Design an enzyme around this catalytic site. Structure first.
Site, PDB file in Angstrom:
ATOM      1  N   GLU A 219       0.803  -1.220   0.000  1.00 17.52           N
ATOM      2  CA  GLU A 219       0.000   0.000   0.000  1.00 17.52           C
ATOM      3  C   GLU A 219       0.844   1.281   0.000  1.00 17.52           C
ATOM      4  OE1 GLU A 219      -3.808  -0.754  -0.010  1.00 17.52           O
ATOM      5  OE2 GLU A 219      -2.331  -1.938  -1.097  1.00 17.52           O
TER       6      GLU A 219
ATOM      7  N   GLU B 208      -5.143   5.174  -0.413  1.00 19.49           N
ATOM      8  CA  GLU B 208      -4.105   4.230  -0.041  1.00 19.49           C
ATOM      9  C   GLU B 208      -3.497   4.590   1.309  1.00 19.49           C
ATOM     10  OE1 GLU B 208      -4.327   1.479  -1.490  1.00 19.49           O
ATOM     11  OE2 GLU B 208      -4.769   1.771  -3.591  1.00 19.49           O
TER      12      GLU B 208
ATOM     13  N   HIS C  31      -5.287   2.818   3.788  1.00 19.78           N
ATOM     14  CA  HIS C  31      -4.962   1.404   3.824  1.00 19.78           C
ATOM     15  C   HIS C  31      -3.651   1.179   4.560  1.00 19.78           C
ATOM     16  CE1 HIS C  31      -7.720   0.750   0.128  1.00 19.78           C
ATOM     17  NE2 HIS C  31      -8.325   1.254   1.192  1.00 19.78           N
TER      18      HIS C  31
ATOM     19  N   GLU D 286      -2.175  -2.711  -8.419  1.00 18.45           N
ATOM     20  CA  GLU D 286      -3.359  -3.280  -7.772  1.00 18.45           C
ATOM     21  C   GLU D 286      -3.488  -4.790  -8.050  1.00 18.45           C
ATOM     22  OE1 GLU D 286      -5.602  -1.377  -5.778  1.00 18.45           O
ATOM     23  OE2 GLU D 286      -4.456   0.398  -6.116  1.00 18.45           O
TER      24      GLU D 286
ATOM     25  N   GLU E 263      -9.502  -3.161  -4.133  1.00 21.49           N
ATOM     26  CA  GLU E 263      -8.541  -3.442  -5.189  1.00 21.49           C
ATOM     27  C   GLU E 263      -9.201  -3.849  -6.515  1.00 21.49           C
ATOM     28  OE1 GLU E 263      -5.704  -5.750  -3.106  1.00 21.49           O
ATOM     29  OE2 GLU E 263      -4.926  -4.005  -2.029  1.00 21.49           O
TER      30      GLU E 263
ATOM     31  N   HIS F 122     -10.095  -0.445  -7.823  1.00 20.15           N
ATOM     32  CA  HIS F 122      -8.905   0.235  -8.306  1.00 20.15           C
ATOM     33  C   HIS F 122      -8.413  -0.361  -9.606  1.00 20.15           C
ATOM     34  CE1 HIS F 122      -8.144   1.881  -3.979  1.00 20.15           C
ATOM     35  NE2 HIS F 122      -9.195   2.426  -4.574  1.00 20.15           N
TER      36      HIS F 122
HETATM   37 MN   MN3 Z   1      -5.752   0.093  -4.134  1.00 19.95          MN
HETATM   38 MN   MN3 Z   2      -5.263  -0.314  -1.176  1.00 16.82          MN
HETATM   39  O    OH Z   3      -5.934  -2.268  -0.869  1.00 17.26           O
HETATM   40  O    OH Z   4      -6.509  -0.059  -2.657  1.00 13.88           O
HETATM   41  O    OH Z   5      -4.618  -0.949  -2.643  1.00 14.60           O
END
Ligand code: MN3
Ligand code: MN3
Ligand code: OH
Ligand code: OH
Ligand code: OH
Ligand code: CA
Ligand code: CA
Ligand code: CA
Ligand code: CA
Ligand code: CA
Ligand code: CA
Ligand code: MN3
Ligand code: MN3
Ligand code: MN3
Ligand code: MN3
Ligand code: MN3
Ligand code: MN3
Ligand code: MN3
Ligand code: MN3
Ligand code: MN3
Ligand code: MN3
Ligand code: OH
Ligand code: OH
Ligand code: OH
Ligand code: OH
Ligand code: OH
Ligand code: OH
Ligand code: OH
Ligand code: OH
Ligand code: OH
Ligand code: OH
Ligand code: OH
Ligand code: OH
Ligand code: OH
Ligand code: OH
Ligand code: OH
Lengths: 266, 266, 266, 266, 266, 266
Positions: free
Chosen positions: F35, F66, F69, F148, F178, F181
């Protein structure tokens, strides 16, 4: 120039071998805040100083002492790896040794023949990115205090990771030398702040935007930092507090690059 | 969780382009003591704290602020690289640009399309080896003071490496925030020292070999450090001095390794 | 230009799987003195040579062979990781696998899907800092001999870290190729020393301060090195010995820096 | 343990300052084959040895001497950086300084205040990946010979990169010390080889696949290496030559991994 | 196993030497997205594959091809460094070379004897952290397309940094091979997506929290990404858009650690 | 500028502690494709864009997500380390903890006080060499898709490495984010390819040597890739196939270097 005696500064022999402890002690040898970082930083700063002999000599005294600590830790690691398990013959001798083997650095045997490396416990090589020498001793004395503080914290943790009296004897000496190193560098720091200022570098007060120099900016929504509001800072002025910091710089508008760069961004 | 506004914390636009200055400012973005090191250290420490809210929130407030500084420096670098020379076309229009090109980071154009990298001026990638979060805030607050001290030192030096008033305006803001950060961290440090002790960690005084805890040891032949002899250390005890440190640990004799290691050492 | 055949140079299949041995073999693949180091060093030196075809072709031959060794170790690692344990479901089928899992490189499963990495056993990425190509083949052939010597020592150690006959068969082949490589490089070294001299580089004898070129200087207080005194060096001249080396350069006094640097040193 | 004197081992003062030469000399201080690599390798090997005092003491004598060379180079860099240009005021005084400024390491002024770093000329940090200490001195003495050979090659090149008599004087001393270090290490090597064998390690001859131990394999299509065919190797056996090396190991097929790894490979 | 021919895959000779271009081309050899990265990644993936031969062979074909590109770039650099300036004698011949010298990598001459290194233009060593081989080829084919895309972008930029027709001829060849590589990897990618799914890995749809799988969360205050709302994703479902993402995880409260750690956090 | 709330984006609390899983989760925090890599790559690209707001805002939105995360993973690791064993007292209380201790990262306790590091599971520091921002968003959007993809593959593997429902709950969220993303970046990539071309960069087609742009070259002796022959590439042209690639560049002959370099090569 330097001279060496084979005699160690202080005892560095454990009562028994312990290859896991050997791995942990690699932190003090090859780690971020270990003795090599101290030796290289203090000698570098000592060689760079063109100022007061009181501090220049203090740095060369201490960086030279740290070489002795490097020597001690290396020696202690070597003793701790005596008879370490590394192959099936050891496991045939004693099957419980599999968990010891699992926790060892595989390189202690394979690469170094059961001797110390200059890496940390995870095999990451010591590197000069850990060293600081800036030319400014107010800043670097502060660094040297942190160096001895993080180190002494690690040595104190190591003290609880073993019950070997031989190992603890060495650790007790290092703890004391680290107490002295923290104290002497704090004294030098204090003397230097009195001369140049508590803010590093101390000659830029007129240049900075003073209006933002004492405001606590609350960027997170917790309320704890509000307790600093109204307290007197070390330079004699009180902190003010801004609950809602504001963006004052506008939105950036950088010019697209030359087509020869092929910066295709939509 | 975090939220972002496109607006910068403070102005970050130079009066003109200067790709040499752009390379120098990479120190503040991807260097050892730069703003990324600040952002990642303070956030890590704040997330790790299970202690007093006053310090935890202070860390999270500041780490979040340093993200704004990262953004500013990245933005300033991009402006500074507008129209930078990178090929024969440019030298055609102005042959003097060759000495400018010689001093630039060749990756600014080639890898990044005239935008910032996360490296220092020499292309060394920023890395986590620069971050400290140890679990002990007496030690880590000392680190944080050092981080802001080395940073403000570098920003002070950058101030003398340009005459661009737009660049200097941004620098004058950073100097001021680094003053605040140095001060707030010093305050936090003083309170934690009062609570836990001035030596880190504060609860090991009974374990260390006390006899060596206040002795200045003269390992280099200068006399400068003798000046500390008899001074009172921050813990209220006086320093003693040993002109001739002695080796107290003997000569090591570690056991030769197993023949399977092939440690042929004569 | 190169071409590839899917067939391996020599057998690289173990009799049985062993994820712990797979981790150790990472040293021969991604480690400081492993096959990638040889491959990259010998190809770089061979591409750099403008000299005798005898040595240039030897380097390209050997560099190309080391690529085969890289292939073989990568393959062996893959076979050794077949069915390795990585989660709860594996423990249920065989709970004795817990210690095996504890000694594995966690990235073999998580990042690589039970395939080899280009790291050493501790996860340290192979890097070009391990490679040497200097333009001088007297020096670089000495480097090549060392590369094969350290490699053959690690392979010899690996031989005692397993009882798998399939693994050992591959190690036996590698030992032999490393014997040949040590020999061919010592032969080339010898020839070059005969052409250019035993000291590298061989054309600087008139420039050096000859007075200091054959003197053994006693910096450490052990007496063992005294045994070299009076022995004949490889250049035909005898070693002399200095029990008390002297500091002949004086004490440095470098000029303090420009005030714009803020080098506050007391 | 170690002791230090402020006096340098040999002269380390240039006649004039030269910040470009300062940057080149960083190679000898923080580079792959520099004096730091020397110091750390010989001291590590010295502390590791449990063998003959003749070689253990030699390693400690030399490791300690290399610390003096580190000290000299650091000092010389310091003198060479005196009055170096680093900002617009310097260019206003003398416009010609722009090319000097372009070739300097921007960190010498910005991070270190016109003092040495522990990096190479490109800002890459010295790191322990350059060090070797394996437990086997037949291999490590070969490494030590190479370390001094690459270093002396570099010092020889530096000699042609300056016309400063003060700089050359220091380089002439280093050349001579590297001559003695190459010789003493070769001497130690030859004695060890007589005791243990010329192939490292010397005790695996009955284990290796002897059929492949003296065959030169032609993997590149040039013809030069055939010149070794029939020559006697150092162990007294002749080389054989194989113009078309065979792949004897077949085509590997390793088992697909468990579905929990999601190794989708078509 | 591999075989080598001295003949280059394609022309790699410049019309004239240019040591600045030599340094730029180091990016293609030792940089993040350069040919060594392609070579080691495709070979690693090809050796790891247990799946369809169509992809496994493609990877080995291309990885082998990339070794030819590494050889070409190394050769090109060697030619570009012919007669490069590195000392006072060069400046005596042509004072105008001072600027050229200031733009060069100092190690090209000092360490490598005017030959290629395995570093990027800034001297940062190529390392295996640049390589990817995960065991999942849907993922790794996407990475391979990226590898060739960043590389070709860099090659396109290099094309504008020289007017040497010989250098451009080589670059024209690489652009074409990089076109083919991009296409073949995108074709393999498309085929694997058809088999396994467009989301990697394709067999986890029932496990993820579907409610958050198609929601664009607007964390920065620009309105640009709102343009995605209602557009159809590659899996056939439309994106929804949340202007105010919410923090759903609560405020963490981790337990204070054991006193043996000395986690003094106030 | 950024603002922070103490509330996590989503649940990050395990049902039970597990110091081994804590070590594996370091991959998602400090690893190559974790991340931190996402956060710094998307913010850097976002800050660099001077093009369409649609993509610039998307990058800043996601880069900011992110960071949440990163915060969640750091928090989850701290909870997983609660009560982890680190010394003899632990083993005296419960001897079965030995295998757990053997599989842990020794620095979690020693350096960080049972808190997260910014390293991968093997203690390799996260570094900027993992980040890409090239100035071309067609290439970088492909990168972002890969980022990702590798991440989601790793998260999917982690899912199978624990049975803790609290940890799994967090992983289920990450998997969904993800998926989004991947999809959003593929959508942007598609739009950009439509505008600029599917080959990156899209404006060099008339420059490349077209003859080699659609030829699959068979460098390895497997027959698998022949299956691509005649298939239509994404640019609408078919692939050809060359079973025996020829070497067209001849044999290089670079000029021997200046004697001042001491390039003794025979
Ligand atoms: Mn991501
Ligand atoms: Mn992430
Ligand atoms: O993630
Ligand atoms: O993510
Ligand atoms: O991610
Ligand atoms: Ca707050
Ligand atoms: Ca002294
Ligand atoms: Ca001695
Ligand atoms: Ca040949
Ligand atoms: Ca937005
Ligand atoms: Ca093929
Ligand atoms: Mn110490
Ligand atoms: Mn100390
Ligand atoms: Mn800041
Ligand atoms: Mn700050
Ligand atoms: Mn080999
Ligand atoms: Mn070999
Ligand atoms: Mn030396
Ligand atoms: Mn030497
Ligand atoms: Mn290519
Ligand atoms: Mn390609
Ligand atoms: O220390
Ligand atoms: O210490
Ligand atoms: O110490
Ligand atoms: O700042
Ligand atoms: O700041
Ligand atoms: O800061
Ligand atoms: O080998
Ligand atoms: O080999
Ligand atoms: O080898
Ligand atoms: O030397
Ligand atoms: O030396
Ligand atoms: O040396
Ligand atoms: O290429
Ligand atoms: O390629
Ligand atoms: O490529």
């Amino acid at each position: 120039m330097f001279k060496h005696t084979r005699k160690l500064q202080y005892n560095a022999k454990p009562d028994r071998s312990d290859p896991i402890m050997a791995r942990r002690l690699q932190e003090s040898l090859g780690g971020q805040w270990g003795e090599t970082t101290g030796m290289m930083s203090y000698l570098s700063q000592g060689w760079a100083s063109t100022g007061a002999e009181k501090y220049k000599d203090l740095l060369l005294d201490t960086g030279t002492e740290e070489m002795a600590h490097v020597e001690m830790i290396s020696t202690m690691i070597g003793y701790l790896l005596e008879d370490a398990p590394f192959g099936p013959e050891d496991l045939k001798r004693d099957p419980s040794l599999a968990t010891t083997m699992a926790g060892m650095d595989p390189e202690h045997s394979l690469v170094h023949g059961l001797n110390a490396s200059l890496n940390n416990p995870n095999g990451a090589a010591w590197n000069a990115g850990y060293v600081t020498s800036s030319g400014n001793l107010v800043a670097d004395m502060r660094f040297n205090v942190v160096r001895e503080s993080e180190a002494r914290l690690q040595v104190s943790r190591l003290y609880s990771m073993t019950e070997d009296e031989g190992v603890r004897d060495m650790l007790k000496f290092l703890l004391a030398r680290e107490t002295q190193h923290q104290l002497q560098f704090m004294k030098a720091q204090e003397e230097l702040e009195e001369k140049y200022g508590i803010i590093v570098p101390g000659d830029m007060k007129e240049i900075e935007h003073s209006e933002f120099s004492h405001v606590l900016m609350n960027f997170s929504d917790g309320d704890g930092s509000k307790a600093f509001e109204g307290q007197v800072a070390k330079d004699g002025e009180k902190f003010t507090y801004q609950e809602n910091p504001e963006a004052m710089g506008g939105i950036p508008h950088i010019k697209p690059g030359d087509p020869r760069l092929h910066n295709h961004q939509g």
